Design a binder for this molecule. Structure first.
Ligand SMILES: [Mg+2]
Ligand SMILES: [Mg+2]
Ligand SMILES: [Mg+2]
Ligand SMILES: [Mg+2]
Ligand SMILES: [Mg+2]
Ligand SMILES: [Mg+2]
Ligand SMILES: [Mg+2]
Ligand SMILES: [Mg+2]
Ligand SMILES: [Mg+2]
Ligand SMILES: [Mg+2]
Ligand SMILES: [Mg+2]
Ligand SMILES: [Mg+2]
Ligand SMILES: [Mg+2]
Ligand SMILES: [Mg+2]
Ligand SMILES: [Mg+2]
Ligand SMILES: [Mg+2]
Ligand SMILES: [Mg+2]
Ligand SMILES: [Mg+2]
Ligand SMILES: [Mg+2]
Ligand SMILES: [Mg+2]
Ligand SMILES: [Mg+2]
Ligand SMILES: [Mg+2]
Ligand SMILES: [Zn+2]
Lengths: 152, 305, 115, 217, 108
RNA sequence: GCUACCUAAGAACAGCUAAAAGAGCACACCCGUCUAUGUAGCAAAAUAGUGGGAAGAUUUAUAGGUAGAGGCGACAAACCUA
RNA sequence: ACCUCGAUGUUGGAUCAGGACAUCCCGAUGGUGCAGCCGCUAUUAAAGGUUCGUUUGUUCAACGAUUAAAGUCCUACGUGAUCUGAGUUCAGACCGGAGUAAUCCAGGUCGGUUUCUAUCUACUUUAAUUCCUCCCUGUACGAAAGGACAAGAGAAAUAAGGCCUACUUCACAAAGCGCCUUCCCCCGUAAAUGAUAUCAUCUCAACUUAGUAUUAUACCCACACCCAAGAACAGGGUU
């Protein structure tokens, strides 16, 4: 029975789970785009958002500095976290990460996903785009909208 | 050939427009049924002995304490009536049963996730599709026109009610948890047997009796709690405060109907027989109706004189 | 909750309960269908190598709210007829036992402090 | 500003409407009876109606060693030794048969749960039943009592030295050897304070609850 | 426990050709409008993703060459500039990664 | 070339208490008390924990010797290439 | 000495129990050397229940404390491909005894390897009882001693099914030590009217009651992501 359990059981235990997520998140902070098993990316997305929030908190915040020191195993990324990512997202309030499924791993056919920080310098992902507004159905719905607006 | 969903071919501009339009239509349909007595209501017969009225489909909100004037605590569950409407009526002859049947639907859900037949039925009825539809056996005296809304005030404090719901599903559970078997000792030599069932049968029969208690799926079945007292009614939010526990998880839909226990056979004399009709407006009910023994909030601290 | 084999503190003026002995008094039987003894339940006691009946007047297990939870399993020695063996009970005694007035009127009268 | 702990709900899937209704009932009862601000460690006196108590009322004075529960069922447990017998009573704040809750001495202990006072020396649980209520300044931060209690021999109700309890009000130096402290440190779980997905942010919930309270007033 | 009798090929065929065993036809496959290769609707296109990954690898190799060693992550934003492209006012004050090829049409 | 015993000439035994000890606690090392797992096993006798000894009648590397009506044996009808 | 010695694993216990009634308790009923309370005996009744401990391997027995009672059996003296091996004539050993000795003793005693990944059958979610308290009542009954029924009220205990508002283990949840709900019979006989047999007779006479089952009602009834749903599958939500 796992009603309400929100954390996956990963690695060799709770500590190993935290360390795996920490390594994935350090890689994400360094490269701004990381491909990894789908479940691990899903688990680490929340921690990535939380680091962005802690970076928003600021350098002077000792709690934020301690959190960054723990979570970024490569200490050169803490200045990055506090001076490149948080300033980038200062305007935003959330949704700093884009996660998209990827064709299964060639080795073990594992469900993989790519997670990136939005606005990175890397080439854009082939994002799935909704159907154009000029399609038949979309044009009919536009006619509906125009008729309703004219009525009101 | 390929499966489709309502958002598959909708553009960025049309998605929010469709959401807003459908939500507006649903709320308009819900509001259109707020005046049943002014829309050719079916005859309202007086209560008679042996009459069985319709019930409701509520939503288990949670639990809270409730103290009675004798200084006794009682755990009381909250059942919220969320968009409960009568949907279908079948007479004695039509249903072939001993009593007529009223279908009651609750917890309006998205129209994009329902079968075409259900969508057609709800479109004809004039209401948005409901999460759950349950059948209540009634006498012809209590027939109600389909589409009429039902409210938590349909019940009243002091009444005794029966609540049916799907129990919390515990999945494939071992014999110890499922049937409360004692199990085997943890120590004193026991090799790989601590929670296993013992002998499942006897040697002679050379088989296992049907109905033998064995490990298997537990919960997620319909169970009924009988004779729960209705301590209080919140008419503003359409909430019933039902004594004790009820089957199912929080935010689960529970079918609520008058108690079938023999002791409570003919206590529906003073209850709204067909159903409570706010449109009648004989006397706007207070925000909260309390049973006589309930220590109402806002009342002086009880002193045992 | 006092069960069998529980070492229980005899809170009573009785010399039988207060005299030293190499064995602490242990509950031998709980006069209740289930072997779990709460406040107000009678029990047997192998005290000073003797079988004596006693009353539970407090226990460590938490009970219903608004009721005291003592740090020691207190018990009062009573005769078979119900009369208390001792003459004074110093420690606090839960007021709920006064619900059993008449059943333990003499024990309650002996009791000094209530909580 | 002080928001009583019972108002802040534990995270879960329960609908906010249940919390709204329960808070309405709690605020009605608070209008009836004044529930004062107090913390785990403050000394309280609860006067409650009891059918069997002499005079039909009973007053119990003790140190609040644990506040638990949320909503109308929230409770606080008061402890005190009475003629050398340690008694704890779990009072329910919104039980209609509590006549009064008086904060005899408003203070905050180093820990949010003083359950270890059971294993501490009796002197740290002894409080005069008839002690007069000390007066605190109108505008003043609640005092924090840094008293570190001495414990009795090692056999305890719980392993208070274990890091998970995170106890700060025990003089572990005078009770446990350095070897015992090192052995207990094996349960440290340092990652638990840094895993950010477990923290429960209640800023918005507290703001909404304060708005509800102000509307009720 | 050991088998009491050999299971016949008829029973074995029943078991191993029961539709529960058989592979399920997938109807979520679709053509990628960009390159025209097949892709699952929810999954990203393999061909396009490989294009992006190879361009990312080139850019990252240039990034590593410019960094020159471990623990030398910049404290400023980064911009990738291709042949025939000059930094803009926004690009000013940002680390320039120069790629020796024309900017891909998909890249912007 | 295992094992029983022996021959030659070697090696090992931290730390603490005690004091020239078939002394005590305790590593390495030797053994295999009890439990669990394993039982076509990692293993044709193991693993984890626990435990006995651990300056001696100790353990142990090398080479040699005793051969089946036999050898060797602090006798367990032990061991002498599963 | 009929199957099984190219193996049917065999004491006691744990676990789960299916069944019989020749009923230990609870139900109804006749008799009594049935005044009452206890009892004894017989008919009917197998829906439900039938305790925990000390020594002992004990099944049992004794004893301690209870209970409404602590039932007799069958089921490979049920159940070791679910468990344990304490006893128990494998290998070691000691004592007493037998024998010249090897060795032995339905003598004691200390130790002593419990295999199996399930192919098939079968199976895996099918209205509750009882005790006690008060009162009746110190009444009926009885010389006293003692001491009831029925009716009524209240409390519990267990069993089943759920649940997390509190407490507790604990913490988006799962749990109990916590809380909540739990609803009908059964038949043995006791009597009316009344023939065969003009009385009488409860009737394998016609017949009238206690006498009810034919249970009643209740429950259920339409890509992808997340989930209180879940091994997979399935199911619910996605407005
Ligand atoms: Mg794993
Ligand atoms: Mg157990
Ligand atoms: Mg084994
Ligand atoms: Mg085990
Ligand atoms: Mg004695
Ligand atoms: Mg404890
Ligand atoms: Mg040495
Ligand atoms: Mg030595
Ligand atoms: Mg010998
Ligand atoms: Mg021999
Ligand atoms: Mg034969
Ligand atoms: Mg013959
Ligand atoms: Mg054979
Ligand atoms: Mg019989
Ligand atoms: Mg036999
Ligand atoms: Mg044996
Ligand atoms: Mg001899
Ligand atoms: Mg033996
Ligand atoms: Mg041994
Ligand atoms: Mg076995
Ligand atoms: Mg198996
Ligand atoms: Mg006649
Ligand atoms: Zn493509």
């Amino acid at each position: 029975i796992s009603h309400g359990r929100v954390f996956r059981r990963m690695g060799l235990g709770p500590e190993s789970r935290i360390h795996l997520l920490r390594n994935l998140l350090t890689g994400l902070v360094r490269h701004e785009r990381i491909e990894a098993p789908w479940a691990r990316v899903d688990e680490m997305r929340g921690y990535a958002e939380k680091l962005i929030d802690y970076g928003k908190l600021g350098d002077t915040n000792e709690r934020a500095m301690r959190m960054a020191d723990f979570w970024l195993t490569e200490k050169d990324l803490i200045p990055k976290l506090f001076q490149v990512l948080a300033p980038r997202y200062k305007d935003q309030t959330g949704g700093y990460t884009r996660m998209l499924q990827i064709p299964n791993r060639s080795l073990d056919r594992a469900k993989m996903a790519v997670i990136e920080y939005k606005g990175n310098c890397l080439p854009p992902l082939p994002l799935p785009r909704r159907d154009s507004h000029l399609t038949l159905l979309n044009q009919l719905l536009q006619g509906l909208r125009q008729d309703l607006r004219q009525s009101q | 050939k390929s499966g489709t969903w309502w958002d598959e071919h909708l553009s960025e501009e049309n998605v929010p427009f469709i959401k807003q339009l459908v939500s507006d239509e649903d709320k308009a349909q819900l509001a259109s049924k707020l005046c049943p007595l002014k829309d050719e209501p079916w005859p309202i017969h007086p209560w008679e002995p042996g009459s069985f009225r319709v019930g409701l489909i509520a939503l288990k909100l949670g639990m809270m304490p409730l103290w009675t004037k004798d200084g006794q605590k009682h755990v009381v569950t909250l059942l919220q009536v969320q968009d409960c409407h009568v949907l279908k009526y079948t007479s004695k002859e039509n249903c072939n049963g001993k009593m007529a049947t009223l279908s009651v639907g609750g917890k309006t859900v998205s129209r994009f996730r329902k079968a075409t037949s259900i969508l057609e039925f709800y479109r004809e009825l004039g209401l948005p599709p409901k999460q759950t539809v349950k059948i209540f056996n009634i006498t012809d005296n209590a027939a109600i026109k389909p589409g009429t809304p039902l409210y938590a005030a349909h019940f009243r404090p002091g009444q005794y009610v029966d609540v049916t719901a799907k129990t919390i599903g515990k999945g494939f559970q071992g014999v110890m948890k499922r049937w409360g078997f004692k199990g085997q000792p943890a120590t004193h030599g026991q090799t790989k047997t601590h929670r296993r069932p013992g002998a499942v049968a006897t040697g002679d029969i050379g088989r296992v009796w049907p109905g033998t208690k064995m490990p298997g799926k537990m919960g997620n079945i319909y169970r009924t709690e009988y004779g729960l007292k209705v301590w209080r009614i919140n008419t503003k939010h359409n909430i019933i405060y039902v004594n004790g526990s009820v089957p199912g998880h929080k935010n689960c839909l529970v079918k609520v109907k008058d108690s079938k226990l023999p002791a409570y056979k003919d206590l529906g004399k003073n209850l709204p027989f067909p159903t409570y009709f706010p449109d009648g407006d004989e006397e706007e009910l207070p925000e909260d109706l309390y049973d006589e023994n309930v220590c109402q909030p806002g009342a002086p601290s009880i002193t045992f004189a | 909750a006092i069960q069998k084999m529980t070492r229980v503190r005899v809170v009573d003026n009785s010399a039988l309960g207060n005299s030293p002995y190499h064995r602490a008094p242990r509950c031998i039987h709980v006069y209740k269908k289930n072997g779990v003894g709460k406040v107000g339940d009678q029990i047997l006691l192998a005290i000073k190598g003797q079988k004596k009946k006693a009353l539970i007047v407090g226990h460590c297990m938490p009970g219903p709210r608004m009721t005291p939870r003592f740090d020691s399993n207190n018990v009062v020695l009573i005769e078979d007829n119900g009369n208390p063996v001792g003459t004074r009970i110093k420690t606090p005694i839960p007021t709920s036992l006064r619900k059993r007035e008449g059943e333990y009127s003499k024990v309650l009268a002996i009791a000094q402090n209530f909580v | 500003r002080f928001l009583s702990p019972e108002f802040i709900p534990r995270r879960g899937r329960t609908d906010p409407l249940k919390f709204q209704i329960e808070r309405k009932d709690m605020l009605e009862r608070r209008k009836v009876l004044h529930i004062p601000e107090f913390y785990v460690g403050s000394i309280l006196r609860v006067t409650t109606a009891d059918p069997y108590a002499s005079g039909k009322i009973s007053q119990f004075l003790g140190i609040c060693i644990q506040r638990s529960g949320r909503g109308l069922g929230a409770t606080f447990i008061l402890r005190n030794v009475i003629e050398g017998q340690g008694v704890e009573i779990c009072f329910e704040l919104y039980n209609p048969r509590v006549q009064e809750i008086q904060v005899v001495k408003l203070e905050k202990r180093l820990d949010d749960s003083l359950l270890y006072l059971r294993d501490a020396l009796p002197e740290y649980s002894t409080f005069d039943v008839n002690m007069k209520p000390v007066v605190q300044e109108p505008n003043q931060k609640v005092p924090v009592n840094e008293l570190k209690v001495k414990m009795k021999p090692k056999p305890w109700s719980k392993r208070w030295e274990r890091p998970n309890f995170n106890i700060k009000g025990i003089r572990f130096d005078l009770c446990l050897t350095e070897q015992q402290m090192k052995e207990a440190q094996k349960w440290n779980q340092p990652w638990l304070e840094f895993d950010m997905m477990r923290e429960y942010d209640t800023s918005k919930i507290e703001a909404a609850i304060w708005k509800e309270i102000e509307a009720s007033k | 426990a050991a088998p009491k009798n050999r299971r016949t090929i008829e029973v074995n065929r029943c078991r191993r050709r029961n539709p529960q065993k058989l592979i399920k036809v997938k109807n979520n496959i679709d053509v990628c409008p960009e390159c025209g290769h097949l892709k699952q609707k929810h999954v990203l296109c393999a061909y396009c993703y490989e294009k992006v990954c190879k361009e990312t690898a080139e850019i990252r190799r240039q990034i590593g060459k410019q960094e020159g060693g471990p623990f030398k992550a910049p404290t400023i934003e980064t911009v990738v500039l291709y042949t025939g492209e000059t930094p803009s006012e926004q690009d000013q004050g940002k680390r320039i990664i120069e790629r020796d090829r024309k900017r891909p049409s998909w890249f912007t």
